Amino acid sequence: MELKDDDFEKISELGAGNGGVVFKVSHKPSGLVMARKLIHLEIKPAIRNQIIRELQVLHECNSPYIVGFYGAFYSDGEISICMEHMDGGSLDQVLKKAGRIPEQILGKVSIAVIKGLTYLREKHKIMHRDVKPSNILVNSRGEIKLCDFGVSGQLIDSMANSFVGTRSYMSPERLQGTHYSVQSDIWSMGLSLVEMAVGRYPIPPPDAKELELMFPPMAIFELLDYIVNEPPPKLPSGVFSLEFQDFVNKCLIKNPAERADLKQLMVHAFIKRSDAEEVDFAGWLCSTIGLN
Ligand SMILES: Nc1ncnc2c1ncn2[C@@H]1O[C@H](COP(=O)(O)OP(=O)(O)NP(=O)(O)O)[C@@H](O)[C@H]1O
Ligand SMILES: O=C(c1ccc(F)c(F)c1Nc1ccc(I)cc1F)N1CC(O)([C@@H]2CCCCN2)C1
Ligand SMILES: [Mg+2]
C-alpha cells in the first residue's frame, strides 16, 4: 500500500536530533503503529524525487538487525520516512535510564551491530555513516536493530552535519578529511560501546578518582584534537573482561587499515563468547526502562 500524509495521525513525539523530527503515528488505513521521521529540506523538486527514489531500496533492507521500513514520501516541504516503531527506543535513551549497560548485554548489541553492518555491506554495498547509541534501536521482543544508515547519497548530502559539540562519534580519518570508508563505522561502534559500558561519552577519559566513584565540558577543537592526536579510549581493566577490552581496542585503532574489519570482529573471542551466552535481553530491557 502507498503511504500519504492525510492517512496518518500523531500519537506522541519520539524526538529530534536534528533537521528530522520523529513522531509515533497511527497509519489509519492499516491500523499499524509506525515511527514517522519528517525531514525539512529546502530542495528543488527534481532532487527531492531522487531522494524518494533512492529511499525505495529500504523496502529491500530486510534483516532482523535492520529497522523495518514502510514507505517514503514528500509532503509539505518535508520528506517522510515511515518505519517500524521500536517500543524500547534508542540505546542512548536506555543508557540514560540504566546509567551503565552490562557487558553481557553489550555483547548482544555488538553481535547485532556487526550483523547489521555486514547485511548492509554484503547485500546492499552501503555503509552506515553514523553508528551511535541513538541510531541503534531496541524493542520488547528483545530485538536490536540499526537505522539512520546512508541508503540515499542525495539525502546524505542534503542533511549536513556537525550538530555535536560535546560528543563526536566520527573516526580520526573522517574528522581529518575525505579519506574514509566502511572502517569508519568500526570506530563509531567501538566508541559507542565504551560509552554504554562506562556510562558517559569517553572523551576526555576518566581519571583515577572518577573510575573509583563509578566502579566543565569540552570545547569543539579540544575534543576533535583529542580524537585525532591523543591515544584512543580504552575500557578500564578488572571491571571488564580482557576479551571485551581487546575487542574495543581492535575497533578503536586510529589507523583504519590496522583497525579490525567486520570479518575479523565476527570471529573475535568476545563475539564467540557472547553468542554462546544465554541472555534475556528483552527481560533486562523492560525491567530497566519500564515496559512489560
Ligand atoms: N523507529 C523508531 N522507533 C522508536 N523510536 C525512534 C525510531 N526512530 C527514531 N526514534 C527516536 O527518535 C529520537 C530522535 O530521532 P533522530 O532524528 O534520528 O535523532 P538522533 O538519532 O538523536 N540524531 P541523528 O539520527 O544523527 O539525526 C531517537 O533518539 C530515537 O529514540
Ligand atoms: O535519518 C537519517 C538518514 C540519512 C540518510 C538516509 F539515506 C536515510 F535513509 C536516513 N534515514 C533512515 C534510514 C533508514 C531507516 I530503516 C530509517 C531512516 F529514517 N539521518 C542520518 C542521521 O543519523 C544524521 C544526518 C546528519 C549527519 C549525522 N547523521 C539522521
Ligand atoms: Mg537517529
Side-chain angles (χ1 to χ4, degrees):
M1 199 197 174
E2 193 192 51
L3 274 38
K4 63 180 205 159
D5 180 82
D6 48 309
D7 274 348
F8 298 95
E9 175 185 78
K10 289 191 199 174
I11 293 171
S12 65
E13 186 173 331
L14 291 169
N18 216 17
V21 178
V22 19
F23 303 89
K24 185 189 184 180
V25 303
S26 197
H27 184 236
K28 296 191 273 198
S30 61
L32 301 184
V33 169
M34 311 187 321
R36 177 200 192 170
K37 186 206 267 260
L38 298 105
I39 308 155
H40 210 92
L41 299 143
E42 292 180 337
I43 282 306
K44 240 172 184 180
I47 55 159
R48 58 95 177 172
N49 284 324
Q50 200 199 317
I51 288 173
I52 275 137
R53 206 147 51 243
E54 288 178 341
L55 283 163
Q56 294 314 301
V57 320
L58 290 175
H59 275 123
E60 276 70 69
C61 289
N62 330 285
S63 166
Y65 315 101
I66 303 299
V67 171
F69 171 81
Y70 294 115
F73 65 91
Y74 178 82
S75 184
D76 226 282
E78 307 225 70
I79 90 96
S80 267
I81 310 150
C82 306
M83 71 203 108
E84 175 181 8
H85 164 256
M86 297 293 288
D87 73 339
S90 90
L91 283 190
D92 149 60
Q93 290 174 314
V94 334
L95 181 57
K96 281 189 214 308
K97 287 162 170 195
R100 223 195 282 149
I101 293 152
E103 205 182 315
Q104 299 225 123
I105 301 293
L106 284 180
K108 209 158 161 186
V109 164
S110 298
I111 288 164
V113 179
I114 302 168
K115 289 186 175 174
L117 289 175
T118 302
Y119 176 80
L120 299 170
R121 193 65 228 168
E122 292 304 302
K123 300 280 212 79
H124 299 273
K125 282 165 179 169
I126 72 110
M127 78 164 278
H128 195 108
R129 295 196 128 87
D130 203 15
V131 179
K132 58 187 193 164
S134 77
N135 295 333
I136 308 168
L137 273 43
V138 294
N139 69 31
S140 51
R141 297 180 291 174
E143 291 173 330
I144 318 171
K145 301 178 176 195
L146 294 180
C147 68
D148 293 12
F149 45 87
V151 109
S152 159
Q154 200 46 247
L155 186 54
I156 281 153
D157 297 312
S158 310
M159 301 177 72
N161 185 324
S162 187
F163 189 48
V164 286
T166 39
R167 300 207 285 222
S168 182
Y169 304 84
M170 278 189 193
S171 72
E173 77 255 28
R174 205 216 148 146
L175 279 182
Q176 280 175 86
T178 56
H179 304 273
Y180 67 91
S181 189
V182 295
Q183 285 301 84
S184 248
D185 295 339
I186 299 308
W187 169 276
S188 300
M189 176 181 66
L191 197 66
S192 299
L193 296 168
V194 178
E195 182 186 343
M196 300 180 287
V198 183
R200 59 161 246 171
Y201 178 84
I203 305 155
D207 53 66
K209 279 188 182 180
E210 250 188 278
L211 287 160
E212 191 193 18
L213 270 156
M214 285 191 147
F215 328 96
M218 253 186 164
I220 337 176
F221 180 72
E222 216 187 321
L223 168 70
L224 300 187
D225 195 57
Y226 197 92
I227 298 167
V228 306
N229 296 306
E230 292 277 23
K234 284 178 167 182
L235 230 32
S237 201
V239 39
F240 299 101
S241 84
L242 294 167
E243 277 93 348
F244 194 22
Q245 289 182 54
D246 188 65
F247 182 91
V248 307
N249 289 13
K250 295 295 162 74
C251 286
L252 296 173
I253 282 145
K254 304 227 262 176
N255 184 317
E258 210 196 323
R259 202 133 84 214
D261 83 311
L262 292 163
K263 235 206 152 191
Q264 289 167 150
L265 295 172
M266 196 71 97
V267 301
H268 193 277
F270 174 72
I271 296 309
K272 288 154 67 224
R273 192 203 76 217
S274 306
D275 249 334
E277 274 152 20
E278 305 171 58
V279 168
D280 174 52
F281 170 67
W284 172 83
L285 171 63
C286 305
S287 80
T288 58
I289 77 147
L291 247 165
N292 279 353

